[PDB]
Amino acid sequence: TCSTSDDADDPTPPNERDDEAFASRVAAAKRELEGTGTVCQINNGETDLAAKFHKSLPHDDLGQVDADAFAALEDCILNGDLSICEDVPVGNSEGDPVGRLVNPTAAFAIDISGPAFSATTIPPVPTLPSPELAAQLAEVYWMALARDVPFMQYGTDDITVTAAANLAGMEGFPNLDAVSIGSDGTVDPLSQLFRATFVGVETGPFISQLLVNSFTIDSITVEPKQETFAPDVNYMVDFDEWLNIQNGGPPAGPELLDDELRFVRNARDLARVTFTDNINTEAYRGALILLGLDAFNRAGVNGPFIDIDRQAGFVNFGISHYFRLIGAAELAQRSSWYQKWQVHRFARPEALGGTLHLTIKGELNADFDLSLLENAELLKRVAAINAAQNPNNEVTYLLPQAIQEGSPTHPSYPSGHATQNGAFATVLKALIGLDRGGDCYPDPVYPDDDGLKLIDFRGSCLTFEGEINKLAVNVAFGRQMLGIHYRFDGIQGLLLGETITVRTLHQELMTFAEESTFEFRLFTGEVIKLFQDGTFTIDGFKCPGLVYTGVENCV
Amino acid sequence: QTCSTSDDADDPTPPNERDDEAFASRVAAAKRELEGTGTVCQINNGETDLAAKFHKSLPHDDLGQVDADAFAALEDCILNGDLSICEDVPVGNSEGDPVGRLVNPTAAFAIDISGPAFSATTIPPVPTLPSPELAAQLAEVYWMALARDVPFMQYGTDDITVTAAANLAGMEGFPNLDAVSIGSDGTVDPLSQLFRATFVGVETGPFISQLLVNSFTIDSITVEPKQETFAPDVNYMVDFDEWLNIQNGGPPAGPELLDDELRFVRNARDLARVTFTDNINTEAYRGALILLGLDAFNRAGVNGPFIDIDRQAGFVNFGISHYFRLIGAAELAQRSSWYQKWQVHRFARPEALGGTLHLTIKGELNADFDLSLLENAELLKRVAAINAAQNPNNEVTYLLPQAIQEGSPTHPSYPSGHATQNGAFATVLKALIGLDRGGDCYPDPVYPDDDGLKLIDFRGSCLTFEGEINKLAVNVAFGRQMLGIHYRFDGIQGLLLGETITVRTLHQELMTFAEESTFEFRLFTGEVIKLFQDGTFTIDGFKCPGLVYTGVENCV
Ligand code: VO4
Ligand code: VO4
8 A cells, every 4th residue: 555656646655645635625625714704794684574584475465464473484494403494384275385484504514615695795775664665566567567679679669668768767867776877867669678788788688699599408509589488477466475485375377388498589589498497408509509609619719728839728728627616606596595485585576575465455564665656657557467367457555576476485685596606607717818808799689579589689799708798687587577586686686696706706716736726707897817926906996805705806 | 894793793703703613613624624634545557658647749659659858847847836837848739739738737736725635535546558447448449439320229239239249258368447337247237338427327228317307497598409410430630640640639620510401319429529519517416406306316405404304495595596506516527537637647548558559450569468459350350441541642541530539538537527526416416305305217218219309208217316316427427438539447447536535525514514414315326324513424324433424435
C-alpha cells in the first residue's frame, strides 16, 4: 500500500492529497465566513394577517385565516421539523396534493457549496395599504385582462392601450421594480407594457428568440409550437371556487385547452409555458440553441482557450461546465425558500384579490390605497369579464386565474421561477462571455398573431445577452401572467438568483488550475469581472468586499 | 438596518451566528471527507510501451509511433496543471483544426468544495496490450463496427451478429470482460446478450431503453424521437493516410454521410449517432421528463419522506428542484474522470491500437497482441473485406472502421466520460425515484421496427423503471463504443465511477437536510444501498464499516 508515491502524474503525494483537499475547502468556507459576517433579514413590518401567506389553512367564509392555525404555521416555519409541520391544520380534508404545504422546512440546510441560505437578502415588500402594492396588484389584474391579446397587437388593442394609460396614472407605478416607462412617465403598450429595464428586455419582440426558434436535442429537431390554453376562460372567479382553493381543496376541474398547437404569441401562451415547465426546461432549450449558434462553442474554444491554440476546454470552459451549472445553479432555490417562508411570508395575488373583492362588496374594510380601490376603469372590466363567466352572471372582482388551482401552496415572494431563471441566465452569460454576449442574434423572428408562422424581424440588433435576459424575464413574468405572482416577486427573485450565482461561479473559478477569469454583463447593465485571487470589479472599479454582495455594495 | 441577535427571520440562530454555523457545518463535512478518504493509491497497469498510451494529435512517424520528446512534453503538460506548459505540447499537423486541440488536460487539478475530491476514488488498471482480456475488449469494438447496420431485432438471424456472438464467446479473455453478458453454458445469445451487460435490467427486453424511444414532453411541446441518423454501410478512417492524418491532429476528411429519412434508434450505428450528437445529459434529461410524466417521480412533490405523511410536499428537497438540480450538478463526476484519463491511466484509444494491429498483421510492426486476436481468422477476413469495399482503390487495411470521420475526441480512452456522467445521472434518477417505485414496470413499452419508422408494442417482460434507467446509461456508454472510440472497460468502469462519486455527493447533501429522511435505491450490480443522515449506510441491510461510501466491495 502506497504512501508517498503512486502511478499518478500528480505532484502531491498520495498521503497528502486528503490534507490538501481539506485545506482548500476550509479556506473556501473561511472566505464565505469572513465575506458574509452578520446579514440582517428585514421585512416590511406589517402585522395584518390579510397580507400574509396562509393558503390551504382553515379560513372563515370571508377568507380570513384561523388564528390558531396561523400560529401553528409560524411554529412549522421556525423549527425545521417535519413532525411540527404535519401539525398545521388544513382547511379542506379531501387530501388533494394541491393542499399540501410546499416544503416549508427546505431552507434549513447548509449546502457545502455556494453562499449559505441566510447570506443574501431581498427587499421588504410594499405593505398592503401602499400605493406601490396597489399598482403592483393592478398590474397582475391587467395582465389577466390582457391574456388573449397577441403581443404585436399591444399598441392597438383596447385592453392594452387602456392598461398602459391606467397603470401610468396610478401614484405607485413609477416605483415598480425596473418598470419600463418613458421619461415623461407614459407607458408605450407595444414596447413597454409588462416589460422591465434589464438589458435587452425592451428591445424588439416581447418574447425571447430562445422561446420561438427551433432547437435540436440528440439529432431531433424541435419546432416550439406548444399545446396551449384556450382563450377567454379564466378560473377562480366564482367566490365559492376561490374560497375552496384558499382552504386547500381540489381544483374545480382541468383547464380548457386549444386544439391548435401554437408558438407563444400572447400572455396566456407565455403563462402556459411557465405552468408546464420543469425547473430549467426553458433555459436548457436556450442553452442548446446558443450552442448551435456558436454563442457558446461546442468544441471547447471558450474562456481562456479563445486566446490559445493547443487546448480546448471541457470540464472547465466547455459543454461539461455549461450543462453542469444549468442544473447546479438551481441551488439558489434554497435561499428563495428561506425568503418565502422564514422571512417575508407574503400573500399571493389571489388572496389579496379576495380581500379586495370583499372590501368592494362592503363585507371587509381593507385599507387598500384609493388608486386601486377607486380604479373604476380596471374594476368595471374585472366585474364584466367575471360576470360573463360566472353562473347567473354574478359579479365578482376576484383576480382571474389562468389555472384552476391558482398558486402553488407556498408564499408569493420571491418567485422561485424568477430566482432560478436569474441563476440560469447568469450561468449562460458568464460562460459565453462579454464579447460574444454583445453579438447580434442571427435571423431573429417573431410569431404571427395566430402563432402559426414565424415572421422575420427587421430592426435593432438583438444581442445574445439581451435575448438570454429576455428569456429569464419572460419566464418570471409568465408566472405573473398566470395570476400567481407580482412584479416584485419576479424582479427581486431574478436579482436574488444572479447574486447567488455570481458567488458560486467565483467560488469555483478560484479552484481551477488553468489561469482564467469570468466577465459578463449583469441584468442592470454593469460589467462584472471575476478573478482567481478573490477580487472582482464592477465596470473596471475594484470592489471593496471579500465576496460579491450586489452592485450597490461595490462602491 | 444593522442587527445582532434578532432580525425578521423566523430562524432559531441569531443573525450574528449564522455565518459561524455555516462555517462549522462545512468544516465538519470537509473533515468527514478527510477522515473517510485517507491515503488513496492510484495504480495503473504499469506497461511502458508507448503504443499502449494516448498521444492523439502529437507528431507521429509514418508507422503511427509517437515522437518520444513530444510525449515527454505531454507528460509534463499532464503533471503540472499549467496552461502555458500544455501550449508547448507539439502538434503533428499545422492546419489549426479544432479537432487537434488537447481536451482540457489540466481540468482535474481543481478541488471542488462539494463531493469527493478528484483523487479520492480509483478505477482498476486497464488490461495490458498483450493480454487476452485486452484482445477480447478490442475484438468486441471491431465486431460492433461490423454489426453497425444490423437491426437489433435481427441479431438472432443476421450472419454478422450470429457469428460475432460465437466468435467472441470462443476468445480466451471474453468471459473475463467487465459485467459481460453470457450464458451459464458459455455461449452468447445474440438477441439478448450480444453487446449487453449484467447491470440490473439491461439484458431484459429490447436492447434500447424505453427512455430513448418514447415521446417526451418539454414545455408543452411533445417530441417523437425520430432522429437525423447516419447513412448505412459507410465507415471512415479505414484508408491508412486518412487514419494517420487523424492521429497527427489533422482535420477530418469530410462530413459523415447522413440518411434522408428520420428514424427511431434501431441499430448500433443509430445508437452511436445519439452519442455523437448528445450534450452531456440530453439523454437522461429526456428520460427524466418521461419518468416524471409517468409518475415514477411525482411532480407535485410526494416523494422521499413526504410519501408517508399528508400535510407537506417536497420541492427543494425531494421534489422537482432537487431532481433537475442534480441531473446537471452530478456532471461534477467528470473532474474525477478527467484525472483518471490523463493523470492516471492515459490509455490508447481503440483506433490507435487498431493502427498497431493493422501494421503488425502487415509485418511492418511487431506488437505482442495475444493470439486470440492476432490469429482470429473470422474477424480478420471480415475487416479486410469491409475496408477493401470502402477504400477507393480497394486496398485492404485492418484499421478499426470508425462511424465518424474525426474518430475519437482528443483525450485518453479510460474511462469513458460519457459513461461516467450517465452512471451519475442514472444514480440520481434511481435515488430520487426510490426503491419501491424503481421496481414498477414501464407502462407502455415498445421497440422500433427494423426500419425505425414505427413503434411495436412489447410484451412478455416487466421492464422495471430502475432497469430502463440502467439500460439508458449502458446504451449511452456502449453507443460510444459503437462509434469505434471506446472499449467495454471504458464504459463499465466509467459507469461504476460515476455511481460511487454520486453516492458520495448524495450522502453529503442528505446529512444537511432539516427534515428526517433517507435515500434507498438499487445500485448497478444489484445490491440495495440505504443512506442515513447520521453518516452511516447499508448494503442489502448490512451496516458498512467505512466512514463514507467507497464501493460495494468495501462494505464487508
Ligand atoms: O414558483 V412561483 O414561486 O413562481 O409560484
Ligand atoms: O467522451 V468518451 O470519454 O466517451 O470519448
